[PDB]
């Protein structure tokens, strides 16, 4: 560390070097902080967490009890110990409270004033943060497994929604248009994720073992269908070209958006080239997931090496994205881990679980 400080101060190394190497050191030293706590407000398991992209101060949380909690992650107290207090909550007495499990919650990118949340009550509700009243509701004929707003779209404000239906619903928040559908899957879409690089590229993963990349502008179907083998087992595409040997219940683009991470119920995670959907053949070992719903996992950002934090049963397994080497397994939960979300400013991780807890993992020292 002193070598790094001397190299920064004297100009030998670009300051980016110290930032990234130190962020990596902080990620490797990630450990259950009993020096930070998150206030318990969910009566049920936390399915989803979303730290706001701008300022990374506030966190959303969606529980299996249908409540939504809005936490403050800043240590406003002068103590070195603090509990991330719950600023707001869409509770059991809120007239717009979700009637069943909240399966996803997402901040509106580009601004903290609005956030969206989808539930098994077959609704995607748009919320105004400040008044904490619904601004819009998109009713679906089938329960929602996962929604996603493009983190990048300065132009369009589409929400890609995956339900048990075989079609992907695109809901335009600008004048409310929930008619657009991307058809081509055959079973429940368990995960949807817009590309962080391309405004109109959407990756959708379904229980039929297939992951498709779409260009929602295009009028001619999915761009790419991910194939495990890349052509070794090639068939006229009616049932082949599966990303996994089970359900694909998790999607995550790497930070730069040039690669796609899929996790499926074959107990595998794969890394794909997001441009041509070619498997990179990164091993990653065995990733125990048997989740019957969407599995939310995140990547690191701004480190010397990129990481992926995947829920591994009751632990959070940390892997290097581009080598497969499992960094470690963070074990502090008591039941299966449903979701983890990465605070990119301080290399902090928050993970929710079915045990009605949200655990902060902070670097040691």
Partner 1 sequence: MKSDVKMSLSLPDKNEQVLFCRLTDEQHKVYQNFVDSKEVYRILNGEMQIFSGLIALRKICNHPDLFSGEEDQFGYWKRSGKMIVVESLLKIWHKQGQRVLLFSQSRQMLDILEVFLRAQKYTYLKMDGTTTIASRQPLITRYNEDTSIFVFLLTTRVGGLGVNLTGANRVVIYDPDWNPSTDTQARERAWRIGQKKQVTVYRLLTAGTIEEKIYHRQIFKQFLTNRVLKDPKQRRFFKSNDLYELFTLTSPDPLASSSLLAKMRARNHL
Give the residues lining the site for partner 1 (CB under 8 A): 108-114, 126, 128, 135-136, 153-154, 157, 173-176
Pick the closer one to partner 1 by CB: 56 or 324. Answer: 56
Residue 345 buriedness (CB in 10 A; 0-12 / 13-18 / 19+): middle
Secondary structure of residue 97 in the 3-state scheme: coil
Secondary structure of residue 26 in the 3-state scheme: helix
Q: How far is the CB of 160 from partner 1 (least distance, A)?
A: 17
Secondary structure of residue 245 in the 3-state scheme: coil
Q: How far is the CB of 173 from partner 1 (least distance, A)?
A: 6
Pick the closer one to partner 1 by CB: 199 or 278. Answer: 199
Q: How far is the CB of 175 from partner 1 (least distance, A)?
A: 7
Exposure string over 133-154, b if 16+ CB within 10 A, otherwise e: ebeeebebebbbbbbbbbbbee
CA–CA gap between residue 316 and residue 288 (Å, rounded): 11
CA–CA gap between residue 291 and residue 311 (Å, rounded): 10
Pick the closer one to partner 1 by CB: 128 or 278. Answer: 128
Residues 6+ away with beta carbon under 8 Å from 148: 104, 106, 159, 160, 192, 193, 194
Pick the closer one to partner 1 by CB: 108 or 145. Answer: 108
Q: How far is the CB of 134 from partner 1 (least distance, A)?
A: 8
Q: How far is the CB of 102 from partner 1 (least distance, A)?
A: 20
In order of 18, 22, 92, the CA distances from 304 in angstroms are 9, 8, 44
Pick the closer one to partner 1 by CB: 159 or 303. Answer: 159
Q: DSSP label at 55?
A: S
Secondary structure of residue 193 in the 3-state scheme: strand
Q: Where are the alpha helices (DSSP H) in the chain?
A: 2-9, 15-28
Pick the closer one to partner 1 by CB: 25 or 57. Answer: 57
Pick the closer one to partner 1 by CB: 18 or 157. Answer: 157
Q: How far is the CB of 171 from partner 1 (least distance, A)?
A: 12
Residue 219: φ, ψ to 5°:
-110, 25
CA–CA gap between residue 190 and residue 289 (Å, rounded): 13
Q: How far is the CB of 113 from partner 1 (least distance, A)?
A: 4
């Amino acid at each position: 560390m002193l070598g790094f400080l001397s190299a920064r101060q004297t100009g030998l190394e670009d300051p980016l070097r110290l930032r990234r190497a130190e962020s990596t050191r902080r990620v490797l030293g990630l450990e259950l902080n009993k020096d930070r706590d998150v206030e318990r407000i969910h009566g049920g398991g936390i399915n989803t967490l979303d730290i706001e992209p701008v300022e990374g101060r506030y966190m959303l949380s969606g529980g299996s009890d249908g409540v939504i909690v809005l936490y403050d992650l800043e240590n406003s107290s002068r103590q070195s110990y603090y509990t991330c207090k719950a600023v707001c909550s869409i509770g059991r007495d809120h007239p717009d409270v979700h009637r069943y499990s909240v399966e996803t919650v997402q901040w509106y990118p580009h601004d903290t004033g609005m956030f969206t949340s989808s539930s098994f009550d077959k609704t995607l509700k748009v919320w105004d943060t400040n008044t904490l009243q619904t601004a819009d509701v998109f009713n679906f004929e089938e329960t929602v497994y996962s929604h996603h707003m493009s983190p990048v779209s300065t132009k369009h404000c589409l929400v890609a929604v995956g339900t048990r239906g075989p079609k992907v619903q695109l809901c335009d928040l600008k004048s409310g248009s929930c008619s657009h559908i991307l058809q081509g899957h055959r079973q429940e879409i368990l995960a949807v994720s817009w590309s962080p690089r391309y405004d109109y590229i959407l990756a959708t993963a379904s229980a039929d073992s297939r992951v498709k990349l779409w260009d929602v502008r295009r009028a001619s179907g999915c761009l790419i269908t991910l194939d495990q083998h890349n052509g070794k087992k090639s068939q006229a595409v009616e049932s082949a070209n599966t990303a996994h040997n089970g359900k694909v219940n998790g999607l995550c683009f790497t930070s730069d958006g040039l690669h796609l991470l899929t996790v499926g119920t074959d107990n595998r995670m794969r890394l794909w080239n997001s441009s041509n959907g070619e498997n990179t053949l990164v091993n990653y070992g065995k990733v125990c997931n048997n989740s019957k719903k969407g599995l939310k996992f995140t990547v690191s950002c701004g480190c010397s090496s990129e990481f992926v934090f995947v829920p591994y049963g009751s632990t959070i397994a940390v892997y290097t994205v581009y080598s497969g080497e499992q960094i470690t397994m963070l074990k502090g939960h008591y039941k299966t881990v449903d979701c983890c979300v990465f605070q990119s400013n301080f290399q902090e991780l928050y993970s929710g679980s079915r045990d009605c807890n949200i655990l902060a993992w902070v670097p040691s020292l």
